[PDB]
């Protein structure tokens, strides 16, 4: 019975060092997460006075309570010895406990009790179904005289884009509103907002977009008002994936554009990098190949071309421009890939002057969120104007992301052949959003032996998979096969007609930058990816499934 | 107002981070000791809920409560964040608190309240004045149905040796009895005893010898019975400091003799190293120059000669013997000095055979407690029989140690020109017993500017000083002068007749091994040592004063 887990504190419970009161084993790594079922609520822990753990200076054995979830939450306490810790009340809806044991000597251990601590706050959450409506604070334009902690999620039928736009925003410890590309703390974070930091319009085709929203009576007046729209799309076949993603049009907001630095005078800001801008452009604080213009596309986007120009100094008529550059991309803005062509990097031939435009279509389309252009050579200085071109992965017909990334596929529908940790969070396998990835028990396994499986929950038309490496000697899958099933019990491998043989799909060349693999549309409730080849570090994988719903007679 | 100190919890009090509730300063090192006036008692602390200290993982700012006194007591708790620690009850009569602040950002801090926690235990302490009597547990031979925590101290008029000898000893966490060469936790520890570890006879001429004695109801039957005697001595002038210290006679107990190792068969134990023993001798487990025979003389003794022999294997008639050796000495068994002759070490020419005895008189007498002989060359193997010769520093006439080592001179009677720590424990200046030593504020001072001073408390005949280096780049004083005074206000330097000039005494050649300096007996209530020269690390010093009481007409 593997120690640790995730407990839903709706019902008060206990957590104790494995043996307790029997002495705890050596070489031990229990971690728990205690969560309340409402954002509203807090967790409270009270320890049993009979508490014994090894002394010294907690160098060796100890208990650690952290505030939130994961090891990078703030440390509420680290204890060891014979004194139980004092009541720990969470500040969020979640707590993380970790027990550590050295390979030498032990003691009785510890027992605590968890339960929901009620603060006074109200859960004002609402789901939004309707074609158009207002999402706002209760009582807006004024203060709702109560704490709040609320989920607003927009849900859209497939083929419908969600447009969210904020009218007023008036709020980072007391108040905040984060926006999620999915279910909160399951989908990726689009961004945390607070203050009068009024957030730019968002267009999501993920099928959900949700806001978590928290307030305090200590903030005198605060609230927000937004509008949402559900606009029908129509996937053409005759459709090129080369539309501009919106530097010139502005569909990419200033908020989304950033850079390593900018000139001291502040007259060559990032927000001037928009293609065809009549006011200078982007230049950094120095000119070196260690510099970059960053655009956050917010949602997982397909990039197919880059177009760049130089810039004429509006105050001096000088002509600055980039002559060549590298491209650097990431799904989360933390893990980065420099675009390759063959073995080594790809140097893009850019401009010959300030005014004229130079286009560069990528070799093949690249799936990402954050984009960095990186100047390598230039004339005079580093000037830059830019458009990005591509389209949505959803613009293909029957090509919806089916829930791994958002959270509409639950943890319960995500299974695997083996897993390396005794007790393994199924959300670890989610494309982009998972903090690490799926690793099997011996991650250097024999091919066709290991697999990850997704239960879509009802029979769907499945048309592709998106495959990604693993974040946390960095594993990714180099080649794989796919089987599908309706019964969960009778399975067909996706066949290759040339070879007459289970088709062997290409995988990733990188632990972060994912790859879309499509195939003839088949009916399936269950899909399985079986790795065949991988990087030297072993199998590490994240996955999403592409497809759409089933639909005549007389 | 320097933060930290020593508080006597007889009256309940408060301790808070300097500013509290004003934010605490950066770069901060407050340490406190909270002590109960009876061994009997425990300390309890309760914290104020309004507790704020910097987070992260207590890497930077924190509070530490340790169980006893000093940094090497067990850690009862280390806290940081916004959660005050839970009640901490001591296990002894003392607690140690330390607050740490980084050079970056702070918070409100902390406040706690201290007071005596009553456990139930009885303080059965007695002082012993009388010529002869029994020191024992209450109710001995049986269990006193109560916890106990008691000081037994023997006090002797000067010129009287104290002899303590134990009849029965029947007791290391629940029960113990430590014996102190002085006032407990002020004088040196002679040794901690517990179990049926029946302690050997002790002869102390220090003027006090005391026992601390602790029991528990969890130990079913325990107690001890001892006898003490006060025997009059008479200091001769015609007296050589060359008496045997008691390997052959046995006045040095087996308990006191030890070694790096011993042969595997257990037939050459340390307890066979007694001079003229008819059963083999001492041999180690290997034969190498990294080996030693150790004798603990218990009290600060004067060593003047070493006599050694070899040994004939009683079971095989072979002849083993040491040919040369080095001598290694320490006042506390932790800090060691290898005896020198001129620059380099002193190799002693020992034996030429097993049977015959070889004497070696030291160059000049050496003041120590722990002695190690260290074989360098030998015939066949390392065999050793041994006598140590010398006498008591007290065997000189009017040469009593006047209280620095024992604690009969109080902290209040110990003053200095400067001191390096803002708030400076006066007991730091005590010969042998002090854990570190007296250091001035800039320990590289201008000569005659700094001084340490001892208020003997009434006008005495002072006849010498004992001077020692400092334990905690190791300071000792190489040359010094001494002034004395009756008024505390009119001061005479001890003059040198040859030079007609304040006499300049030789100091130490070592941070541990002390040196006795005597002089014409003068009347004095106050004595001052003024360092003139020192080691490269600066002034560091410990001191005792030698002398005796004032006494005719018609």
């Amino acid at each position, epitope marked *: 019975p593997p120690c640790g887990g995730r407990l839903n504190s709706k019902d008060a419970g206990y957590i104790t060092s494995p043996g307790y*009161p029997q002495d705890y084993p050596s070489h031990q790594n229990c971690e728990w997460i205690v969560y309340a079922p409402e954002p509203n609520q807090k967790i409270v822990l009270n320890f049993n006075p009979h508490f014994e753990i090894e002394k010294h200076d907690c160098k060796y054995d100890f208990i650690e309570i952290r505030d939130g979830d994961s090891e990078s939450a703030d440390l509420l306490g680290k204890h060891c010895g014979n004194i139980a810790p004092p009541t720990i009340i969470s500040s969020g809806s979640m707590l993380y406990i970790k027990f550590t044991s050295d390979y030498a000597r032990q003691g009785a251990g510890f027992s605590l009790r968890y339960e929901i601590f009620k603060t006074g706050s109200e859960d004002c959450s609402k789901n939004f179904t309707s074609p158009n409506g207002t999402i706002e604070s209760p009582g807006f334009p004024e203060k709702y005289p109560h704490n709040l902690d609320c989920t607003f999620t927009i849900l859209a039928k497939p083929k419908m884009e969600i447009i969210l736009q904020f009218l007023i925003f008036d709020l980072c410890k007391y108040d905040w509103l984060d926006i999620w590309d999915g279910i909160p703390h399951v989908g990726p974070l689009i961004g945390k907002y607070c203050g009068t930091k009024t957030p730019s319009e968002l267009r999501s085709s993920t099928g959900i977009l949700s806001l978590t929203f928290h307030t305090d009576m200590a903030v005198a007046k605060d609230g927000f008002s937004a509008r949402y729209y559900l606009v029908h799309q129509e996937p053409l076949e005759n459709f090129q994936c080369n539309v501009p993603l919106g530097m010139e049009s502005g569909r990419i907001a200033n908020e989304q554009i950033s850079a390593s630095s900018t000139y001291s005078d502040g007259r060559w800001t990032p927000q001037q990098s928009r293609l065809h801008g009549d006011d200078n452009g982007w230049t950094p604080n120095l000119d070196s190949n260690k510099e970059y213009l960053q655009v956050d596309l917010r949602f997982l986007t397909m990039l197919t071309a880059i177009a760049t120009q130089g810039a004429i100094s509006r105050e001096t008529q000088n002509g600055y421009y980039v002559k060549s550059y590298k491209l650097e991309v990431s799904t989360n803005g933390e893990d980065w890939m420099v675009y390759r062509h063959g073995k080594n990097h790809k140097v893009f031939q850019a401009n010959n002057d300030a005014t004229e435009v130079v286009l560069n279509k990528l070799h093949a389309p690249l799936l990402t969120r954050f984009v960095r252009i990186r100047p390598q050579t230039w004339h005079s200085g580093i000037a830059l104007r830019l458009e990005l071109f591509g389209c949505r992965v959803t613009d293909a017909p029957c090509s919806n992301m089916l829930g791994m990334l958002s959270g509409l596929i639950a943890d319960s529908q995500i299974s695997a052949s083996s897993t390396q940790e005794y007790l393994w969070s199924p959300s670890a396998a989610r494309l982009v959003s998972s903090r690490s990835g799926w690793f099997p028990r011996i991650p250097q396994a024999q091919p066709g032996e290991e697999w990850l499986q997704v239960d879509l929950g009802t029979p769907k038309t499945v048309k592709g998979v998106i495959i990604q490496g693993a974040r946390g000697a960095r594993a990714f899958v180099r080649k794989f096969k796919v089987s599908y099933s309706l019964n969960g019990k009778d399975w067909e491998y996706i066949q290759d007609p040339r070879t007459q043989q289970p088709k062997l799909f290409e995988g990733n060349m990188h632990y972060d930058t994912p790859d879309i693999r499509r195939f003839d549309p088949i009916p399936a409730q269950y899909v399985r990816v079986y790795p065949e080849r991988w990087s030297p570090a072993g199998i590490g994988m994240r996955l999403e499934v592409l497809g759409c719903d089933w639909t005549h007679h007389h | 107002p320097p933060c930290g100190g020593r508080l006597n919890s007889k009256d309940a009090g408060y301790i808070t981070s300097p500013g509290y509730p004003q934010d605490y300063p950066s770069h901060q090192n407050c340490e406190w000791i909270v002590y109960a006036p009876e061994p009997n008692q425990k300390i309890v602390l309760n914290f104020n809920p309004h507790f704020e200290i910097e987070k992260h993982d207590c890497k930077y700012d924190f509070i530490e409560i340790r169980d006893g006194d000093s940094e090497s007591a067990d850690l009862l708790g280390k806290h940081c964040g916004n959660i005050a620690p839970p009640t901490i009850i001591s296990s002894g009569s003392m607690l140690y608190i330390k607050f740490t602040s980084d050079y970056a950002r702070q918070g409100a801090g902390f406040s706690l309240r201290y007071e005596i*926690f009553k456990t139930g235990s009885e303080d059965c302490s007695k002082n012993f004045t009388s010529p002869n009597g029994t020191i024992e547990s209450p109710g001995f031979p049986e269990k006193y149905p109560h916890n106990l925590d008691c000081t037994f101290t023997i006090l002797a008029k000067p010129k009287m040796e104290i002899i303590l000898q134990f009849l029965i000893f029947d007791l290391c966490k629940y029960d113990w009895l430590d014996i102190w060469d002085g006032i407990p936790h002020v004088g040196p520890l002679i040794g901690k005893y517990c179990g049926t570890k029946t302690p050997s006879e002790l002869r102390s001429s220090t003027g006090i010898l005391s026992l601390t004695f602790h029991t528990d*109801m*969890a130990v*079913a*039957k325990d107690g001890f019975s001892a006898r003490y005697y006060l025997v009059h001595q008479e200091p001769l002038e015609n007296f050589q400091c060359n008496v045997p210290l008691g390997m052959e006679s046995g006045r040095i107990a087996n308990e006191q003799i030890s070694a790096s190792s011993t042969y595997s068969d257990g037939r050459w134990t340390p307890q066979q190293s007694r001079l003229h023993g008819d059963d083999n001798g001492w041999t180690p487990n290997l034969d190498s120059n990294k080996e030693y025979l150790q004798v603990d003389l218990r009290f600060l003794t004067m060593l003047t000669a070493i006599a050694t022999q070899g040994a004939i294997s009683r079971e095989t008639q072979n002849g083993y013997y040491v040919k040369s050796y080095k001598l290694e000495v320490s006042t506390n068994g932790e800090d060691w000095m290898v005896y020198r002759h001129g620059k380099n070490h002193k190799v002693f020419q020992a034996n030429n055979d097993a049977t015959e005895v070889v004497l070696n008189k030291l160059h000049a007498p050496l003041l120590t407690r722990f002695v190690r002989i260290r074989p360098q060359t030998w015939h066949s193997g390392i065999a050793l029989r041994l006598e140590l010769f010398g006498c008591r520093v007290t065997d000189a006439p009017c040469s009593n140690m006047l209280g620095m080592l024992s604690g009969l001179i109080a902290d209040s009677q110990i003053s200095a020109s400067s001191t390096q720590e803002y708030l400076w424990s006066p007991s730091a200046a005590r010969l042998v017993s002090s854990r570190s030593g007296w250091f001035p504020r800039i320990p590289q001072a201008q000569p005659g500017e700094e001084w340490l001073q001892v208020d003997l408390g009434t006008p005495k005949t002072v006849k010498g000083v004992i001077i020692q280096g400092a334990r905690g780049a190791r300071a000792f004083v190489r040359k010094f002068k001494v002034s004395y005074s009756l008024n505390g206000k009119d001061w005479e330097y001890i003059q040198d007749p040859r030079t007609q000039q304040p006499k300049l005494f030789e100091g130490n050649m070592h941070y541990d091994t002390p040196d006795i300096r005597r002089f014409d007996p003068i009347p004095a209530q106050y004595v001052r040592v003024y360092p003139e020269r020192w080691s490269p690390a600066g002034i560091g010093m410990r001191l005792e004063v030698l002398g005796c009481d004032w006494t005719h007409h018609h």
Partner: antibody
Amino acid sequence: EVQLVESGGGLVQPGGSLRLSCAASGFTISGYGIHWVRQAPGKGLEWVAYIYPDSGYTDYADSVKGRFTISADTSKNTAYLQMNSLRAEDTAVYYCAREDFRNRRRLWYVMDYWGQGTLVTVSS
Amino acid sequence: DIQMTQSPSSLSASVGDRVTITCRASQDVSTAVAWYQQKPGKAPKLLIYSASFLYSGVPSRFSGSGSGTDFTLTISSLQPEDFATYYCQQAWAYLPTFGQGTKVEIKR
């Protein structure tokens, strides 16, 4: 000298209420465990409840849970046991006993000192 | 709750006889078992803690063994004053419990 002296026991109407007092002399009760153990006339010892006043940890035998409320006033160095909705079968002598657990894993839930007992009788 | 049951529930035996009370716990209890002695109309007295450790003042003629689910008190040289009722208690679970008790009678 460590002592416990109960008081406040006696005859009481069924359904009625009553409040025992365990009064510590010789030591501070906070930072010990104070247990109540009852003994029905000529029958064995039943553990009923306990308190650890520093923390507040309390707990109760099912036979009394919901009806009894152990508590402690450390300014008065006393522990209480407030019994409500009293049934006949609560009739017994009620001992309070000390548990010394801090630093003593082998003596956890061991009751080293016992009060003299007070008699609670439940009759119409 | 962990239940403790004692064996026998009463015994008579002569002065100087060795005497053996037994206590079986309804599930493993490591050595966490205490023995008390109750004389009639008096509060119980701790005799043994942690299965085998004599508490202060207790005549060494008392001793405890046991190690898991069966435990045993032993009065080696019975005395008149040892007339009493003897309780075992488990000191392991969150909630303590006692045995129903063994009543010792002296045979004269």
